[model samples]
Target: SISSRVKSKRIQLGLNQAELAQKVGTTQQSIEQLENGKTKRPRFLPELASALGVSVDWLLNGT
Candidate 1:
């Protein structure tokens, strides 16, 4: 799942949710939700990709 992959990458980067959110110009709550698979907005995928320095496919499929 995207959330799981995101969480994995974030951990690999040694970034907490708050740190990632700050880097992405978002709130910690939003990051938590995204990493928890609670976000339904399709736009979040691209936003997370941008924040993580990865492609959308990588975020969604870990490719």
Candidate 2:
């Protein structure tokens, strides 16, 4: 779901976790946890969607 999608889009953008974290205004550790499926609901979802150049709807619902 979101975890997989996060990883996919991040990789597609050629950015490492730390780079994405900076853009999303979060920690790399948090992104690692998120991509590992440990965080079910991320607090920075909207920012993440923007940083990853994707819509929140697609990031959440894959639509």
Candidate 3:
């Protein structure tokens, strides 16, 4: 799932939620919600993917 993938990538990059959020221009709460699987389709997918150093399709489909 996107949540697990997001969490894994974030950890792999040694970045905490706050750092990731800053990179994505979002709030830590947003990252928390995403990693916690609270958000299904956030509008910041593209930015989030970029910050995570992944493609949007990979983030969504693990491709």
Candidate 4:
């Protein structure tokens, strides 16, 4: 539920996704996918490598 947590922290700070992504260091679209629960990349996880942007990596890593 990393995305859920992202939403949690972001909303707490009153930040939109872009701002949160900036603080966390990433893109607004990435954050949107995460917060919307659209970031699941079971297929993209192992082969992820460098395909994911910073926030996408951190937000989906589940750890």
Candidate 5:
């Protein structure tokens, strides 16, 4: 699922949710929502891709 994918990628990058939030300019709570796939279009959606070192397409579709 999107949530797992997000989490796995973040962990692979050695970044905790809070760290990713700050790197991408967001709140840890917001990161939590996203890790659970709660926010489809989070405030830092685009930045999430950059922060995760991935593409938005990969982040959503796993490819």
Candidate 6:
């Protein structure tokens, strides 16, 4: 799942959800939702990729 991929990348980078949220200009709750695979919007992909320094495609299909 995308959340699992995001979580794995975050762990590899040693970034907590809050820190990632801060970097992405989002709230921790939003980050949690993404990490938990509960995001309701489609906008997360670009921001998450930008914040995590990953390609959007990579973020979505890194497994």
The best candidate in terms of lDDT: 3
| Residue-wise C-alpha lDDT for candidate 4, range 1-63, written one tens digit per residue | 756665775666677777666655567777787677776664443322232323545656644
Model 4 segments beyond 4 Å from truth? Answer: 1-3, 40-63
User: Of the candidates shown, which would achieve the greatest TM-score relative to the real structure?
Assistant: 3
RMSD of each: 1.7, 1.2, 0.9, 6.5, 1.0, 1.9
Give Cα-based local distance difference scores for all models: 0.79, 0.88, 0.90, 0.58, 0.87, 0.81
Which candidate order results from sorting by TM-score in descending order? 3, 5, 2, 6, 1, 4
lDDT of 6 at 41: 48
User: Residues 1-63, candidate 3, lDDT per residue (tens digit)?
Assistant: 978998999999999999999999999998998998787678999999888889888887888
Q: Residue 18 lDDT in model 6?
A: 87
User: Model 6 misses residue 29 by how many Å?
Assistant: 0.2
Q: Candidate 3, after superposition: displacement of residue 52 in Å?
A: 0.7
Q: What's each prediction's TM-score?
A: 0.79, 0.87, 0.92, 0.49, 0.90, 0.81
**For residues 1-63, what per-residue lDDT tens digits would candidate 1 score against the true structure?**
877787888998888998988888788998887888787555666777877788876765668
lDDT of 1: 0.79
lDDT string for model 2 (15-48, tens) is 9999999999899999999888687657898888
Model 1, backbone clash pairs (residues 3+ apart or across chains), number: 0
